[PDB]
Amino acid sequence: TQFEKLMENMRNDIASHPPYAPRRGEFCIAKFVDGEWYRARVEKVESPAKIHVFYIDYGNREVLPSTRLGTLSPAFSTRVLPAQATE
Amino acid sequence: SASYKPVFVTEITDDLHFYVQDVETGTQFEKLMENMRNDIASHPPVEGSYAPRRGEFCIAKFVDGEWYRARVEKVESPAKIHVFYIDYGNREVLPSTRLGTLSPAFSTRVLPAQATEYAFAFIQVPQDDDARTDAVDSVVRDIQNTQCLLNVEHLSAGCPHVTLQFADSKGDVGLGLVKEGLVMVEVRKEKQFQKVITEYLNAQESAKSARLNLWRY
Protein backbone atom coordinates (compact mmCIF):
# COMPACT_ATOMS: atom_id res chain seq x y z
CA THR A 1 0.00 0.00 0.00
CA GLN A 2 0.89 3.70 -0.15
CA PHE A 3 1.14 3.61 3.62
CA GLU A 4 3.49 0.62 3.76
CA LYS A 5 5.71 2.25 1.10
CA LEU A 6 5.75 5.58 2.99
CA MET A 7 6.59 3.83 6.28
CA GLU A 8 9.49 1.94 4.63
CA ASN A 9 10.86 5.14 3.11
CA MET A 10 10.45 7.14 6.35
CA ARG A 11 12.10 4.46 8.52
CA ASN A 12 15.01 4.27 6.07
CA ASP A 13 15.43 8.04 6.33
CA ILE A 14 15.26 8.12 10.14
CA ALA A 15 17.85 5.34 10.45
CA SER A 16 20.07 7.35 8.12
CA HIS A 17 19.26 10.66 9.87
CA PRO A 18 18.28 10.00 13.51
CA PRO A 19 16.56 12.88 15.35
CA TYR A 20 12.14 18.89 18.76
CA ALA A 21 9.69 21.26 20.48
CA PRO A 22 6.15 19.80 20.90
CA ARG A 23 3.20 22.11 20.33
CA ARG A 24 -0.54 21.42 20.10
CA GLY A 25 -1.44 20.63 16.52
CA GLU A 26 2.17 20.14 15.40
CA PHE A 27 3.14 17.13 13.28
CA CYS A 28 6.02 14.93 14.35
CA ILE A 29 7.37 11.44 14.34
CA ALA A 30 6.79 9.45 17.54
CA LYS A 31 8.62 6.32 18.68
CA PHE A 32 6.00 3.78 19.80
CA VAL A 33 6.55 1.03 22.46
CA ASP A 34 7.63 -1.39 19.71
CA GLY A 35 10.68 0.87 19.27
CA GLU A 36 9.55 1.94 15.80
CA TRP A 37 8.83 5.43 14.47
CA TYR A 38 5.41 6.56 13.26
CA ARG A 39 3.76 9.74 11.98
CA ALA A 40 1.95 11.54 14.82
CA ARG A 41 0.31 14.83 15.84
CA VAL A 42 0.83 16.50 19.22
CA GLU A 43 -2.65 16.80 20.71
CA LYS A 44 -2.02 17.93 24.27
CA VAL A 45 1.14 19.04 26.05
CA GLU A 46 0.59 18.19 29.73
CA SER A 47 4.32 18.37 30.49
CA PRO A 48 7.74 17.53 28.95
CA ALA A 49 7.44 13.94 30.18
CA LYS A 50 3.78 13.75 29.14
CA ILE A 51 3.13 14.67 25.47
CA HIS A 52 -0.25 13.35 24.27
CA VAL A 53 0.12 12.25 20.64
CA PHE A 54 -2.22 10.77 18.09
CA TYR A 55 -0.74 8.33 15.58
CA ILE A 56 -2.22 9.81 12.44
CA ASP A 57 -2.04 6.66 10.37
CA TYR A 58 -3.25 4.15 12.95
CA GLY A 59 -5.70 5.96 15.24
CA ASN A 60 -4.02 5.07 18.53
CA ARG A 61 -3.22 7.64 21.21
CA GLU A 62 -0.31 7.68 23.61
CA VAL A 63 1.26 9.83 26.31
CA LEU A 64 5.07 9.82 26.00
CA PRO A 65 8.19 11.89 26.73
CA SER A 66 9.28 14.51 24.20
CA THR A 67 12.58 12.65 23.99
CA ARG A 68 10.66 10.09 21.90
CA LEU A 69 9.49 12.72 19.38
CA GLY A 70 11.21 14.06 16.25
CA THR A 71 10.61 16.31 13.24
CA LEU A 72 8.43 14.93 10.44
CA SER A 73 10.47 15.49 7.20
CA PRO A 74 8.68 17.21 4.26
CA ALA A 75 9.09 13.98 2.28
CA PHE A 76 6.60 12.31 4.67
CA SER A 77 4.10 15.10 5.37
CA THR A 78 0.33 14.82 5.02
CA ARG A 79 0.59 16.49 1.58
CA VAL A 80 2.57 13.47 0.48
CA LEU A 81 0.03 11.06 2.04
CA PRO A 82 -2.93 12.16 4.18
CA ALA A 83 -3.43 10.86 7.71
CA GLN A 84 -4.68 7.31 7.23
CA ALA A 85 -6.77 7.34 10.44
CA THR A 86 -9.48 9.81 11.58
CA GLU A 87 -8.48 12.08 14.46
CA SER B 1 12.40 -5.38 19.72
CA ALA B 2 11.91 -7.12 23.06
CA SER B 3 10.25 -5.71 26.15
CA TYR B 4 8.19 -8.42 27.81
CA LYS B 5 5.49 -7.27 30.20
CA PRO B 6 3.67 -9.65 32.56
CA VAL B 7 -0.08 -9.45 31.84
CA PHE B 8 -3.16 -11.28 33.04
CA VAL B 9 -5.17 -12.39 30.01
CA THR B 10 -8.89 -11.98 30.89
CA GLU B 11 -10.90 -12.58 27.71
CA ILE B 12 -10.48 -14.09 24.26
CA THR B 13 -12.96 -12.68 21.79
CA ASP B 14 -14.67 -14.64 19.03
CA ASP B 15 -12.60 -12.64 16.52
CA LEU B 16 -9.40 -13.96 18.12
CA HIS B 17 -8.55 -10.68 19.82
CA PHE B 18 -7.93 -10.66 23.55
CA TYR B 19 -7.97 -8.41 26.53
CA VAL B 20 -5.20 -8.24 29.13
CA GLN B 21 -4.58 -6.52 32.42
CA ASP B 22 -1.23 -5.09 33.53
CA VAL B 23 -0.07 -7.26 36.42
CA GLU B 24 1.47 -4.12 38.02
CA THR B 25 -1.92 -2.58 38.81
CA GLY B 26 -3.60 -5.85 39.80
CA THR B 27 -3.67 -5.17 43.52
CA GLN B 28 -5.14 -1.67 43.09
CA PHE B 29 -7.85 -3.25 40.99
CA GLU B 30 -8.43 -5.90 43.69
CA LYS B 31 -8.75 -3.18 46.36
CA LEU B 32 -11.19 -1.10 44.27
CA MET B 33 -13.46 -4.08 43.56
CA GLU B 34 -13.75 -5.01 47.23
CA ASN B 35 -14.39 -1.38 48.20
CA MET B 36 -16.96 -1.01 45.43
CA ARG B 37 -18.74 -4.27 46.19
CA ASN B 38 -19.06 -3.35 49.88
CA ASP B 39 -20.61 -0.01 48.93
CA ILE B 40 -23.08 -1.67 46.53
CA ALA B 41 -24.13 -4.11 49.25
CA SER B 42 -24.86 -1.22 51.64
CA HIS B 43 -26.43 1.02 48.97
CA PRO B 44 -28.11 -1.22 46.36
CA PRO B 45 -29.12 0.59 43.16
CA VAL B 46 -32.81 1.56 43.27
CA GLU B 47 -34.96 1.44 40.14
CA GLY B 48 -34.68 3.52 38.29
CA SER B 49 -31.98 5.86 39.58
CA TYR B 50 -30.01 4.80 36.52
CA ALA B 51 -30.93 5.61 32.91
CA PRO B 52 -28.77 3.69 30.39
CA ARG B 53 -27.38 5.68 27.47
CA ARG B 54 -24.78 4.51 24.93
CA GLY B 55 -21.33 5.58 26.19
CA GLU B 56 -22.32 5.88 29.84
CA PHE B 57 -20.43 4.09 32.66
CA CYS B 58 -22.25 1.89 35.18
CA ILE B 59 -21.99 -1.07 37.46
CA ALA B 60 -23.29 -4.34 36.07
CA LYS B 61 -24.16 -7.54 37.94
CA PHE B 62 -22.44 -10.45 36.18
CA VAL B 63 -23.47 -14.13 36.01
CA ASP B 64 -21.54 -14.93 39.20
CA GLY B 65 -23.91 -12.61 41.02
CA GLU B 66 -21.16 -10.06 41.60
CA TRP B 67 -20.92 -6.45 40.47
CA TYR B 68 -18.26 -5.05 38.13
CA ARG B 69 -17.50 -1.74 36.36
CA ALA B 70 -19.01 -1.48 32.89
CA ARG B 71 -19.87 0.85 30.06
CA VAL B 72 -23.10 0.92 28.08
CA GLU B 73 -22.98 0.14 24.37
CA LYS B 74 -26.26 -0.62 22.48
CA VAL B 75 -29.56 0.02 24.31
CA GLU B 76 -32.17 -2.27 22.69
CA SER B 77 -34.84 -1.88 25.41
CA PRO B 78 -34.87 -1.72 29.22
CA ALA B 79 -34.68 -5.54 29.13
CA LYS B 80 -31.74 -5.63 26.71
CA ILE B 81 -28.81 -3.30 27.36
CA HIS B 82 -25.46 -4.18 25.79
CA VAL B 83 -22.59 -3.56 28.20
CA PHE B 84 -18.78 -3.87 28.12
CA TYR B 85 -16.95 -4.87 31.32
CA ILE B 86 -14.17 -2.25 31.26
CA ASP B 87 -11.70 -4.04 33.52
CA TYR B 88 -12.01 -7.50 31.93
CA GLY B 89 -13.12 -7.10 28.32
CA ASN B 90 -16.18 -9.34 28.09
CA ARG B 91 -19.55 -8.09 26.93
CA GLU B 92 -23.07 -9.00 28.02
CA VAL B 93 -26.69 -8.11 27.29
CA LEU B 94 -28.59 -7.50 30.53
CA PRO B 95 -31.78 -5.90 31.87
CA SER B 96 -31.61 -2.45 33.43
CA THR B 97 -32.43 -4.11 36.77
CA ARG B 98 -28.89 -5.62 36.67
CA LEU B 99 -27.29 -2.21 36.13
CA GLY B 100 -26.60 0.66 38.51
CA THR B 101 -24.87 4.03 38.84
CA LEU B 102 -21.06 3.92 38.94
CA SER B 103 -20.34 6.21 41.88
CA PRO B 104 -17.40 8.68 41.52
CA ALA B 105 -15.37 6.94 44.24
CA PHE B 106 -14.90 3.97 41.88
CA SER B 107 -14.70 5.88 38.60
CA THR B 108 -12.23 5.65 35.75
CA ARG B 109 -10.58 8.80 37.15
CA VAL B 110 -9.80 6.95 40.39
CA LEU B 111 -8.54 3.90 38.48
CA PRO B 112 -8.48 3.65 34.67
CA ALA B 113 -10.20 0.83 32.78
CA GLN B 114 -7.90 -2.13 33.41
CA ALA B 115 -8.39 -4.15 30.23
CA THR B 116 -6.50 -3.44 26.98
CA GLU B 117 -7.38 -5.09 23.64
CA TYR B 118 -4.68 -6.74 21.52
CA ALA B 119 -4.39 -9.04 18.53
CA PHE B 120 -1.75 -11.70 17.69
CA ALA B 121 1.11 -10.55 15.47
CA PHE B 122 2.13 -12.55 12.42
CA ILE B 123 -1.00 -14.65 12.02
CA GLN B 124 -4.26 -14.55 10.07
CA VAL B 125 -7.58 -14.90 11.93
CA PRO B 126 -9.45 -17.68 10.07
CA GLN B 127 -12.40 -16.32 8.06
CA ASP B 128 -14.49 -19.47 8.39
CA ASP B 129 -16.58 -19.36 11.57
CA ASP B 130 -15.84 -23.02 12.37
CA ALA B 131 -12.05 -22.74 11.91
CA ARG B 132 -12.00 -19.52 13.96
CA THR B 133 -13.98 -21.14 16.78
CA ASP B 134 -11.35 -23.92 16.87
CA ALA B 135 -8.53 -21.33 17.18
CA VAL B 136 -10.35 -19.31 19.88
CA ASP B 137 -11.07 -22.54 21.81
CA SER B 138 -7.34 -23.45 21.84
CA VAL B 139 -6.41 -19.99 23.14
CA VAL B 140 -9.20 -20.01 25.76
CA ARG B 141 -8.05 -23.42 27.03
CA ASP B 142 -4.37 -22.45 27.18
CA ILE B 143 -4.21 -18.83 28.32
CA GLN B 144 -7.59 -17.37 29.30
CA ASN B 145 -7.56 -16.15 32.90
CA THR B 146 -3.82 -16.83 33.25
CA GLN B 147 -0.60 -14.80 33.48
CA CYS B 148 1.45 -14.42 30.27
CA LEU B 149 4.28 -12.24 28.98
CA LEU B 150 3.39 -9.76 26.25
CA ASN B 151 5.61 -8.05 23.70
CA VAL B 152 4.19 -5.31 21.46
CA GLU B 153 5.20 -5.97 17.83
CA HIS B 154 3.54 -3.10 15.90
CA LEU B 155 0.63 -0.70 15.45
CA SER B 156 -2.32 -1.57 13.23
CA ALA B 157 -5.58 0.05 12.08
CA GLY B 158 -7.34 -1.47 15.12
CA CYS B 159 -5.54 -2.59 18.27
CA PRO B 160 -1.81 -3.24 18.36
CA HIS B 161 -0.40 -6.63 17.34
CA VAL B 162 1.62 -8.50 19.95
CA THR B 163 3.23 -11.81 20.75
CA LEU B 164 2.39 -13.67 23.92
CA GLN B 165 4.66 -16.06 25.80
CA PHE B 166 3.31 -18.86 27.98
CA ALA B 167 4.40 -19.00 31.60
CA ASP B 168 7.17 -21.50 32.44
CA SER B 169 8.99 -20.81 29.15
CA LYS B 170 6.55 -22.98 27.14
CA GLY B 171 6.93 -20.59 24.21
CA ASP B 172 5.17 -18.31 21.76
CA VAL B 173 1.36 -18.69 21.92
CA GLY B 174 0.60 -17.51 18.37
CA LEU B 175 3.41 -19.65 16.99
CA GLY B 176 1.83 -22.62 18.79
CA LEU B 177 -1.43 -21.99 16.94
CA VAL B 178 0.53 -22.03 13.67
CA LYS B 179 2.34 -25.27 14.59
CA GLU B 180 -1.02 -26.89 15.29
CA GLY B 181 -2.50 -25.85 11.93
CA LEU B 182 -5.17 -23.72 13.64
CA VAL B 183 -4.16 -20.41 11.96
CA MET B 184 -2.19 -19.34 8.87
CA VAL B 185 0.83 -17.01 8.89
CA GLU B 186 0.58 -13.33 7.98
CA VAL B 187 3.71 -12.71 5.93
CA ARG B 188 4.98 -9.30 7.12
CA LYS B 189 7.37 -7.48 4.76
CA GLU B 190 9.14 -5.15 7.25
CA LYS B 191 12.86 -5.86 7.68
CA GLN B 192 12.93 -6.41 11.42
CA PHE B 193 10.25 -9.12 11.14
CA GLN B 194 12.20 -11.16 8.55
CA LYS B 195 13.61 -13.65 11.08
CA VAL B 196 10.38 -14.18 13.05
CA ILE B 197 8.36 -14.57 9.86
CA THR B 198 10.81 -17.24 8.72
CA GLU B 199 10.23 -19.05 12.04
CA TYR B 200 6.44 -18.87 11.60
CA LEU B 201 6.48 -20.04 7.95
CA ASN B 202 8.63 -23.02 8.96
CA ALA B 203 6.10 -23.94 11.67
CA GLN B 204 3.35 -23.62 9.10
CA GLU B 205 5.16 -25.98 6.72
CA SER B 206 5.36 -28.43 9.63
CA ALA B 207 1.59 -28.21 10.25
CA LYS B 208 0.91 -28.65 6.53
CA SER B 209 3.05 -31.83 6.35
CA ALA B 210 1.36 -33.25 9.42
CA ARG B 211 -2.00 -32.35 7.84
CA LEU B 212 -3.28 -30.73 11.05
CA ASN B 213 -6.57 -28.85 11.43
CA LEU B 214 -6.71 -26.23 8.61
CA TRP B 215 -4.47 -28.57 6.58
CA ARG B 216 -6.56 -31.71 7.19
CA TYR B 217 -7.57 -31.93 3.52
Side-chain angles (χ1 to χ4, degrees), chain B residues 45-93:
Chain B
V46 37
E47 71 163 72
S49 284
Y50 185 71
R53 295 193 59 186
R54 179 180 297 269
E56 181 181 17
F57 291 96
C58 71
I59 53 176
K61 193 184 163 187
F62 189 49
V63 300
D64 60 348
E66 255 82 31
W67 290 88
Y68 295 82
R69 307 195 295 178
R71 195 214 266 270
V72 177
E73 305 196 313
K74 199 187 220 164
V75 177
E76 281 183 79
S77 76
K80 288 183 186 178
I81 299 157
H82 289 59
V83 308
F84 168 70
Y85 286 92
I86 65 168
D87 300 310
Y88 290 95
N90 52 308
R91 292 172 157 85
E92 175 166 44
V93 180

Side-chain angles (χ1 to χ4, degrees), chain B residues 20-51:
Chain B
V20 308
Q21 296 172 341
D22 186 352
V23 163
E24 288 169 342
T25 56
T27 42
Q28 302 164 46
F29 188 24
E30 189 194 2
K31 288 161 167 190
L32 197 43
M33 286 306 320
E34 200 204 333
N35 283 356
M36 186 182 87
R37 281 172 183 158
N38 281 342
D39 197 49
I40 294 161
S42 300
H43 317 258
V46 37
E47 71 163 72
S49 284
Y50 185 71

Side-chain angles (χ1 to χ4, degrees), chain A residues 4 8 11-12 32-36 38 55 57-60 85, chain B residues 1 3 5 152-160 188 190-192:
Chain A
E4 291 170 350
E8 177 172 3
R11 311 297 231 259
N12 282 356
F32 181 62
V33 300
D34 62 355
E36 295 293 308
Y38 298 85
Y55 288 96
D57 297 316
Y58 296 99
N60 299 263
Chain B
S1 174
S3 335
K5 28 267 167 200
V152 184
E153 305 285 356
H154 63 83
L155 287 176
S156 178
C159 56
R188 299 300 291 194
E190 299 84 358
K191 293 292 180 187
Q192 88 272 15

Side-chain angles (χ1 to χ4, degrees), chain B residues 94-135:
Chain B
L94 18 59
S96 55
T97 56
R98 294 187 71 100
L99 307 181
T101 299
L102 175 62
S103 88
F106 314 114
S107 89
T108 275
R109 282 184 57 90
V110 178
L111 184 74
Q114 291 292 117
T116 304
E117 196 194 2
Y118 295 107
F120 289 108
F122 314 135
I123 73 168
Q124 306 184 43
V125 177
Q127 300 280 184
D128 292 2
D129 294 350
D130 50 14
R132 187 168 64 257
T133 299
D134 284 353

